[PDB]
Design a protein around this motif. Structure first.
Motif, PDB file in Angstrom:
ATOM      1  N   UNK A 264       0.865  -1.078  -0.074  1.00  0.00           N
ATOM      2  CA  UNK A 264      -0.360  -0.073   0.025  1.00  0.00           C
ATOM      3  C   UNK A 264       0.714   0.962   0.075  1.00  0.00           C
ATOM      4  N   UNK A 265       2.170   1.082   0.761  1.00  0.00           N
ATOM      5  CA  UNK A 265       3.142   2.588   0.511  1.00  0.00           C
ATOM      6  C   UNK A 265       2.870   3.337  -0.783  1.00  0.00           C
ATOM      7  N   UNK A 266       2.306   2.221  -2.242  1.00  0.00           N
ATOM      8  CA  UNK A 266       2.994   2.843  -3.590  1.00  0.00           C
ATOM      9  C   UNK A 266       1.410   3.899  -3.888  1.00  0.00           C
ATOM     10  N   UNK A 267       0.577   3.893  -3.361  1.00  0.00           N
ATOM     11  CA  UNK A 267      -0.547   5.154  -3.482  1.00  0.00           C
ATOM     12  C   UNK A 267      -0.111   6.088  -2.784  1.00  0.00           C
ATOM     13  N   UNK A 268       1.294   6.606  -2.205  1.00  0.00           N
ATOM     14  CA  UNK A 268       1.631   7.645  -2.244  1.00  0.00           C
ATOM     15  C   UNK A 268       2.175   8.181  -2.769  1.00  0.00           C
ATOM     16  N   UNK A 269       2.559   8.119  -4.387  1.00  0.00           N
ATOM     17  CA  UNK A 269       3.363   8.255  -5.374  1.00  0.00           C
ATOM     18  C   UNK A 269       2.423   7.752  -6.851  1.00  0.00           C
ATOM     19  N   UNK A 270       2.628   8.966  -7.577  1.00  0.00           N
ATOM     20  CA  UNK A 270       1.449   8.233  -8.760  1.00  0.00           C
ATOM     21  C   UNK A 270       3.264   7.326  -9.718  1.00  0.00           C
TER      22      UNK A 270
END
Length: 440
Positions: A264-270
């Motif tokens: 879910x870390x990936x939702x913090x960036x494009x």
């Protein structure tokens, strides 16, 4: 906390209109076309099972002899208007084109090398024709560019001497020149997607990667640049030595995807993912019976997966040597298009919804706080579990295609059973939820 000259520039997500468009597009197509399309996986009567665009490496073919394929480059069936209509029909909002792959062959008539479309029987500026045809259909164009170049003898895998350093500095000028040329010849370009940047030579020259990013941004207002380009002062790629993302979006998810529970870390960036239809073929390979070939539903699953976690997905096509697409790829594009046309309100301009993942499929969130349930696995229980975040309630559920009302039953604090539709849709389907946040 480490100080860096060539680390990250952006603070969080770019929110200018040009990045918003990149993001809202969500679904794109990849085109791999080059000299590798001619042999198509076969060299001297031996069919190689590796990626057809790497055949020069598998069959140990020298540059001089590989680039002599230019003499057979004559895509008679090529028609940029057909290609663009195929992309429109598929539902793609953008296309990423191989301007130059590792082999070094340019699809535009570069003035900085002899290995271009101009010195082929076909002669024509294929890239320029594609830019115009795609732009005419309202489809953004992005440029794939391979830094690693097997055609230029000044290329170096590592800097082990002062001679190596002198040669490689000339190579980076050559590269800069081709990049400037592309940005000024084709100013509608929205993105540059770098590849072949993993070698030690590039890791040792972080300064250059940051310069290429800054150079292209001054030449093309609002252009996007992928993380794969970038190395920092210390040679750390994608994310700098303070763990900050370089470039405008993360571009490491190639034939794999972040885990919907753990990553879910990936939702913090494009971010943007790309994929192939067979297991590992980007360029045209004549025999697709050698590995598993994904079905359309398997591809749609991955598209929605990406969007559900706040990223884009790009599906690859490897055109034939004649300039037409093989039948399997036409079938795929048509099948995706049919589904996108019906359920694409849950994909285009959608993002991460903030809900706990469930087994039936994926949630996506719309621009006006619509929450879509995209169902891929139909429960025998006839109930689709929906667990809401703290303070969120579900007021209504609606089948997207028909508008029919869908029963929602509260089962516990923060959890509901949303009924399946009365008639099984027979395909992956969408239920739209109306949600309310207490005094999203």
């Amino acid at each position: 906390e480490i100080p860096l000259k060539y680390g990250a520039t952006n603070e969080g997500k770019r929110q200018d209109p040009a990045m918003q468009k990149f993001r809202d597009n969500r679904l794109g197509a990849f085109i791999h076309w080059g000299l590798y399309a001619i042999p198509g996986g076969e060299w001297n009567g031996k069919v190689y099972g590796g990626a057809a665009e790497w055949l020069k490496s598998w069959a140990k073919v020298p540059a001089d002899e590989w680039l002599k394929l230019m003499d057979q480059w004559n895509p008679t069936k090529f028609d940029a208007k057909k290609w663009a209509k195929m992309a429109k029909e598929m539902g793609t909002k953008y296309v990423k084109i191989t301007t130059k792959h590792h082999e070094g062959f340019c699809l535009w008539p570069s003035k900085y090398t002899k290995y271009t479309v101009a010195n082929t029987p076909y002669k024509r500026d294929i890239l320029g024709e594609l830019v115009k045809a795609y732009n005419d259909e309202g489809i953004d164009v992005h440029f794939y560019f391979s830094v690693m170049d097997w055609s230029n003898p000044d290329y170096r895998y590592d800097i082990k001497s002062k001679e190596d350093s002198i040669a490689f500095s000339r190579f980076l000028e050559f590269t800069d020149n081709q990049l400037k040329e592309l940005a000024t010849r084709y100013p509608t370009v929205k993105d540059f997607w770098f590849d072949g940047t993993w070698d030690a030579s590039v890791k040792k020259n972080g300064w250059w990667t940051a310069h290429a990013e800054q150079m292209l941004k001054e030449l093309v207002p609002g252009v996007a640049i992928n993380s794969r380009l970038r190395a920092d002062d210390k040679g750390k790629r994608h994310f700098d030595s303070n763990g900050r993302l370089m470039g405008d979006y993360e571009s490491g998810y190639e034939r794999r995807l972040p885990d919907p529970v753990k990553d879910l870390k990936v939702t913090q960036w494009d971010w943007e993912a790309c994929m192939t239809i067979p297991e590992n073929q980007w360029g045209y390979h004549k025999d697709w019976s050698l590995s598993y070939v994904k079905t359309p539903i398997e591809v749609i699953d991955r598209i929605v997966h990406a969007v559900s976690m706040g990223g884009n997905m790009v599906v690859n096509f490897g055109p034939q040597a004649d300039g037409d697409f093989r039948p399997e790829e036409k079938a795929m594009a048509t099948a995706i298009g049919k589904w996108m046309n019906r359920y694409g309100k849950a994909v285009y301009a959608c993002d991460y919804a903030g809900f706990e993942k469930q087994d039936w499929g994926y949630y996506t969130r719309g621009k006006n706080d619509e929450v879509y349930m995209v169902v891929f696995n139909q429960p025998y229980s006839e109930r689709l579990i929906v667990k809401t975040p703290k303070g969120i309630t579900v007021e209504k559920a609606t089948l997207l295609t028909t508008g029919e009302d869908i029963t929602v039953v509260e089962t516990t604090r923060n959890e509901y059973n949303v009924s399946v539709p009365k008639k099984n849709p027979g395909e992956p389907y969408v239920i739209q939820l109306k949600v309310r946040a207490a005094k999203y």
